[PDB]
Amino acid sequence: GYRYAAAILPTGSILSTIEVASHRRLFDFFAAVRSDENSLY
Amino acid sequence: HQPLIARDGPHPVEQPVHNYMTKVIDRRALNAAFSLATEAIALLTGEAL
Numbered sequence: 001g002y003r004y005a006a007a008i009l010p011t012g013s014i015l016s017t018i019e020v021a022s023h024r025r026l027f028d029f030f031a032a033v034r035s036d037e038n039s040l041y
Numbered sequence: 042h043q044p045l046i047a048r049d050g051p052h053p054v055e056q057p058v059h060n061y062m063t064k065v066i067d068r069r070a071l072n073a074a075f076s077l078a079t080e081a082i083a084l085l086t087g088e089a090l
Binding site for chain 1: 075076077078079080081084
C-alpha cells in the first residue's frame, strides 16, 4: 500500500468491507484519501 | 368510480357517485463530485511526457 505501484497487483482479497480507521488505527501507515492526491503519482 | 347497493325501505335512495382527484408530482435532485488531482490532469492531457 505504501509503495503504490506494488498495489497495482492487489494479489489478494479485499474482503471485509468495514469502516477502516474508525477501528483501532493499529496500522503503521495508512492514508485516508479522497478521489485524488498528488503524492499518488 | 364506486359500486352501489339497492337499499330498501325507510332510507334515502342511494345514488351513484364518482370522485375525481388531482395530485401533483415532485421535483428533487441529487449530486456527487470527483475533484481530480491537479498535476495528474497535466500528466494525462499531454505536454508532460
